[PDB]
Amino acid sequence: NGEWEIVHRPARVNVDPRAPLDSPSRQDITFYLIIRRKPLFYIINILVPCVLISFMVNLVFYLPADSGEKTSVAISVLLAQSVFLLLISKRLPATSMAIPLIGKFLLFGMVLVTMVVVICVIVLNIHFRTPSTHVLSEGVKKLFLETLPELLHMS
Amino acid sequence: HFPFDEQNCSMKLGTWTYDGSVVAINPESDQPDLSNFMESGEWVIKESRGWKHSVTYSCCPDTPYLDITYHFVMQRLPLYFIVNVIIPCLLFSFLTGLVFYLPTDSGEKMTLSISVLLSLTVFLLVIVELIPSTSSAVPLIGKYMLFTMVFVIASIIITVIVINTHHRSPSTHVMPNWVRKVFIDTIPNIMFFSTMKLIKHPEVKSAIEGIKYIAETMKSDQESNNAAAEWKYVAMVMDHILLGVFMLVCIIGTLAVFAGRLIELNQQ
Amino acid sequence: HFPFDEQNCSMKLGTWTYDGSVVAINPESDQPDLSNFMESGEWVIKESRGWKHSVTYSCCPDTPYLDITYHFVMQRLPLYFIVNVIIPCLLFSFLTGLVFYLPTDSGEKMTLSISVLLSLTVFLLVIVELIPSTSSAVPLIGKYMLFTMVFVIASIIITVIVINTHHRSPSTHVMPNWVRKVFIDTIPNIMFFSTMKHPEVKSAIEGIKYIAETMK
Amino acid sequence: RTVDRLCLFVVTPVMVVGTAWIFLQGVYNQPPPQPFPGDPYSYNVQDKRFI
């Protein structure tokens, strides 16, 4: 099969000791198929685009606040992840035994992108402060302009 | 080679419970009868042929097992996939490179690149439904779409780097000497380069010192403006190089994907 | 009138090969039996009735054939389509007109308008899927979708005109007298807002005068 | 800018490590060596269980 490879293929005669002899459920012969999915299609067409697009959101921290395009990038990444979730919702059953691995990654990436959008909002809020609106205390200056830049090895 | 693929589909027919020593089957003709064949709007049957096969197992030398296999070699008609799939992907690939000719000061590079990415993501919904879902090999059209996605994402990354470079100032950075030598001196020489690169009164005393303060302030501002202009020029040079590189990548990737199979089909 | 539509679905029943002169069918009652009818979550049967007819066909010109036609007049319950389809369209339609309260200097007018258009475009697929490809009529929901679409298109066009007017450079374009007469004088009355000797010393003097004239 | 660089150095490794963990659960997911847990027999013609 184009998507499944057979790993094991046993056969067994199953007899229920508790069932009566005159029951049809006493005996059966079962043939099992252990099959492994070949994930190349899903890899190429879903996972690499989705993972790359999700990782792309980290670029907003290297975007200057003067570009005026950070939150747009982040929310667009969230929209793309939503489209991927729409794509994946049509391919699996709506069962409750477990969250699929792709679903786990999509939820994780969406939570992280939401956090990134919030961080971008906070950073932009800090960037556009002026004397007429906010007061820049000396402790804030000492921390964020002399201490952390030295620790973070910024240019 | 999808959608420029050729298939070889067979129909093996035989008597299920009779062997060749009780019932013998022979072909009526060397080919299937196609005199009453309705035209297909998706496939062209290039060749058709029926072969009889007889198998004798070593255990039973007097009992042949017979079959007749009719095979059809068929060629897909690719116009539907060319129009609906390949051309939009080519348009997105072309649009990918245009960001590197957009100025940074426009404030719209991220808009262009991200919108191309969103269009490609929406186009994924057509791709997945119109592409085979097998894992024996990657479809050629799927290779092209993965190519386009990878290089639009690369364009976004490099555009973020370019925008970061454009906005650098002496208040945050100092130009390394290697950056100057590489981008302002050597590269433009292999490029067009048509681009630059009584008094005791406190009040009169205060006025004189103030006028000097204004003059010094704008001298410093002009120096910082020149440094920022150097950074912006470096960004523009990188943008021009990247425009050339990405347009070249678009053309060469499209050809390197399709031209092999298209030339193979032209020879036949 | 979809999704507020009423339908009249019929069921014509008759003996295929026996005409009325050999086999006669009579209705058991004037109405279909609805005693065991299961309630529908999508339709309400307003009326139901069975009529007997005697019809002559081209195949059998001399023998009329009998039929009983049971018709049901049903009314759709529109709550599902109101909540799932109409309300988002109301939201986008209301957001359409707000671009004209958004200042030009924000630089976000086209973002809002085009994004509203994108949302309505994404919503057009549902309305496309929900109705037949029938030319007898345009559905009411389709009329509303088309109206909202044209509304957003006109909003985008007029927003582009407003943005063009806002950024009009003084040097390139002199204000026409008709513009100053209508928009600055006539119209603001109906509404209510405000209505709108070393050479070096000589060189320095000329420089100060130059700065003053430049700020002029 | 400083807050942005700190967020770059904190958020990105977290996402990288989380993605790596999630997909490494699946990459090394394999069917068991034997068809039936607790039963060592392979159920293959290479090991015929003669009487």
Added chain:
Amino acid sequence: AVEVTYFPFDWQNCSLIFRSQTYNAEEVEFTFAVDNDGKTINKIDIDTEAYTENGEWAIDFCPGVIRRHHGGATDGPGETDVIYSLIIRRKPLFYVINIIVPCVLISGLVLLAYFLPAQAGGQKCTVSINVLLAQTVFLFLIAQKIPETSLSVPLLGRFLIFVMVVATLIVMNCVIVLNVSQRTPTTHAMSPRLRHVLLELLPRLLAPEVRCCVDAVNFVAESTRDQEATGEEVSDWVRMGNALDNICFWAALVLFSVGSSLIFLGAYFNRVPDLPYAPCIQP
């Protein structure tokens, strides 16, 4: 088989072929039934008491023909069949309101980018590229409706691809105009050829205290003069970009209008041919 070329403004030719499954023409033959007047009914019969009209498809013609073949001695016994040809015309009203008109309007919105300013808060690219995103959504829609054969291209798909190509070219045009308009003297050298073409040829075609204070004042005057000259050069670049936008708008309008008109006039001239048969349904 569906001829897709003028879909949804298309007409089809569907066959209904009837034959005896068992008997050759010598054993069983066919004739058409005759009406009450004795006239041969060589067509699909329509009884007004037992006919219903399809909302989407109108039946214009429905002739019937009795074919005889393999009568030659080399073929053996003769064979016969009866073929009815339903010539049906789509009623495209649904596709016109629900798909074509929205697509046309949203595609035409791209022409508005020429009228937005070529500055930071102009949003030309934001309009054109998002029109390209809406067209991609329309592609997703249309893929669920058009036939999936490759003998020709449906008119709907051809129009969509055409408007997508036009939108892409207009995105490129917007990028070029933004590039030209936003050139600054500190990073771009004035081009006399482009300026002369765009702005001239083309409109025609169609004590130390005193000395140091004086030095500071002179420095301020020269700085103001340099700023004014730089602003002037920026103004020339902006004007050249405006002229380019002005002519490119007319070029794009002509291209869009001509291509759309040709594509849809292809549908206008696709009418059911004037056949010599009687109409299928009497009026």
Added chain:
Amino acid sequence: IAPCILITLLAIFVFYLPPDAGEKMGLSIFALLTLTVFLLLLADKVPETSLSVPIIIKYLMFTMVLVTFSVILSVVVLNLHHRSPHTHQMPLWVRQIFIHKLPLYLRLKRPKLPELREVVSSISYIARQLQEQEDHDALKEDWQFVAMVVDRLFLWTFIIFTSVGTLVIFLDATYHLPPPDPFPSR
């Protein structure tokens, strides 16, 4: 449910984005577009009857109304922010309420020889022009402070309404338990 919660938090945080960033409209409207995508996702799973409305659909329409109101209120804030100081005079009641009373209750503290004759005339003109520039700056800052106060008020209002509505709907869903007995007494 989780994407709806995330989009709702972003809708709340739009009111903390400064007007000068020029990004409120993009964030709010793309949040709305994402909600529309999830409406398409839910359209393939929900029952299609009309006797009642699913609670998840009520939650999804409540979120859509919240994001739409975020768009509307962000437009109002931007209108206040970019208000031209000279064409618009601040009404006295606006000043009193939004600059004096409301900021205290919202914990918003606002910080704080003919040549010589011609030279004198030019200097006086320049100083006068800078004075008018300062007055225009002061009026613009008053309008922008009003915009900031209104934005903070809407932030708190959105937080409160969101928390109350989400709590109500989630408690209504959570306490819907199966019957203890197959045949309850009615």
